[PDB]
Structures are given as structure tokens and as C-alpha cells.
Amino acid sequence: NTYEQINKVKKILRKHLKNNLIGTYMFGSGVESGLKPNSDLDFLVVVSEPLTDQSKEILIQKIRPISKKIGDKSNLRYIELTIIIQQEMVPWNHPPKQEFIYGEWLQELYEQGYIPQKELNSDLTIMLYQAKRKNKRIYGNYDLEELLPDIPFSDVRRAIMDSSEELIDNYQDDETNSILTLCRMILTMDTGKIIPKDIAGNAVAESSPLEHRERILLAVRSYLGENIEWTNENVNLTINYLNNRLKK
């Protein structure tokens, strides 16, 4: 069950962070759009004091058994956890301070003893900007709108352009999400609001040349139920186009 994992994630954070936990909120496809066949569960966690090396590994070990893994024919969904410190957000600075991350793309590192340390993250500005706009409080005495300062849209542009370089250099084995996120970056730069992946893809597609329109529309269907295979499509030509269109 999908509501079963969220209830399990709530218990792990509550009974291990204890009174250090201020609140737990979801953003992403859960609160805004609808969960598409291969969507994920995006959580934003706000705590009071920094976590220790031993406390971070506990989460990695406790979250692992209930999160889908890349390559599974499973009923579970990918669990994404991001932990921020409420005091480290004010005064607002870009990029903000990120305390912890749980990403299934980082799984082959979690197994080798990798423990994410306090690091800066421009992409977290985009995450926080859309989380503060709409989310689901699953635990906490407060709303996330009460725990964060108002994030200016100028820093969101900076986050888009800074986080763009990591995405374009890493589309391999993530072609469907890299194409759509670039489409979401192009719009957010020009329209302001955050758009679901399918709509943002369909919008930038019909605003693009035919050779790129078709590959974007091809990713819109993969984000939905379709089983697209990018083996002989050359996504590089399209992400370079979406890059230069975003770069301009």
C-alpha cells in the first residue's frame, strides 16, 4: 500500500529523532500532482539540532527496508528524505544548508558506508520553494509555511541555473526525468509557477523543433504508463537543446 509506507516513514522519524523532530512534510507528486506509475515519495524533515554520524546511519538502515530499490518489480515506491535544520535557514541564504539526504540513487554508496554530511545544495532551494507553496504536514505542531522564511524567486532562478549543470551531465539512465525537469526549469524561469512533469513536458514540446518535440513527448509518455526504451533515440541532442534554451 502507498499510504502504508508514509505511515511507516512517520513512525521511523518520530521514534528515532524523538524530541529533535520539529515536523515532517511531503511535497512532490503526493501533494500537488497525482502519483504516476513510477513516482516517488518526497519528504522534507525539519529538526532542531544537527544529527550525528551514528544517527544518520540509523535512518539509512531503518528507511532502506521500506523503500523501493532501483530495478524492482515491486509495489513499493522510492522514498526520498531530506532533513533541514530550522535554525540554519534564517537569515535566508542561497544555497541553503542541507543536513541529510536519503536517495535511492545513492544506495550503492549507503552500502559502502557513505553517510551524507552537512553540505550546501542549490537544488534544495527549488525543493523548499515548492514545498512551502504546497505540501502535506504528516507530523509536527507547525506548518512548513511557519518554519521557513519566504524564499525570493531570484534565488529560485539561481538554483535552476546552478542545479542545471548537474542534471545535464547525468541524464544517462535517467533520460525521462532529465528531459522533463529541464522542461520544468524552462517554464519556471519564464512562468513562475511549478508545473507537474507531464504538463511541463507537453508545453515545452509544442514549443520546440520537431526532432526534440517528439523526444520530449516520448518522455511524457514514459513518465506516465508507457514503457519507453531510450536505447536508439540519442537523448543527448534533446537535452543539449533544452540546455541552450534554458541557458538563454
| Site for ligand SCM, rule CB under 6 A | 40, 78, 80, 103-105, 123, 174, 177
What does the alpha-carbon distance between residue 79 and residue 59 come to, in Å, rounded to a whole number? 12
Q: How far is CA 154 from CA 159, 164, 174, 209, in A?
A: 9, 15, 28, 29
- Under the rule (CB under 6 A), what is the footprint of ligand ATP? 28-29, 36, 39-40, 42, 123, 126-127, 130, 160, 163, 177, 181, 184-185, 188, 194, 197
Q: Of these partners, Mg ion, ligand ATP, ligand SCM, none, which one is at the site of residue 96 (CB under 5 to 8 Å by kind)?
A: none
How far from the centroid of its chain's Cα atoms is residue 57's Cα?
21
Q: Closest CB to Mg ion among 29 and 107?
A: 29
In which residue are the cell numbers 531570484 written? 154
Q: How many residues bind Mg ion (CB under 5 A)?
A: 5
In which residue are the cell numbers 500532482 written? 33
Closest approach of Cβ 23 to ligand SCM, in Å? Answer: 19
In which residue are the cell numbers 534554451 written? 245
What does the alpha-carbon distance between residue 201 and residue 46 come to, in Å, rounded to a whole number? 31
- Which residue from 10, 16, 20, 29 is in contact with Mg ion, where contact means CB under 5 A? 29
Question: According to the binding rule CB under 5 A, does residue 25 interact with Mg ion?
Answer: no
Question: According to the binding rule CB under 5 A, does residue 104 interact with Mg ion?
Answer: no
Grid coordinates given for 94:
542561497
User: How would you classify the pairing of strands 119-120 and 97-98?
Assistant: antiparallel
Question: According to the binding rule CB under 5 A, does residue 28 interact with Mg ion?
Answer: yes
Question: According to the binding rule CB under 5 A, does residue 123 interact with Mg ion?
Answer: no
Q: Closest CB to ligand SCM among 128 and 147?
A: 128
In which residue are the cell numbers 551531465 written? 169
Q: Of these partners, Mg ion, ligand SCM, ligand ATP, none, which one is at the site of residue 160 (CB under 5 to 8 Å by kind)?
A: ligand ATP
What does the alpha-carbon distance between residue 116 and residue 63 come to, in Å, rounded to a whole number? 15
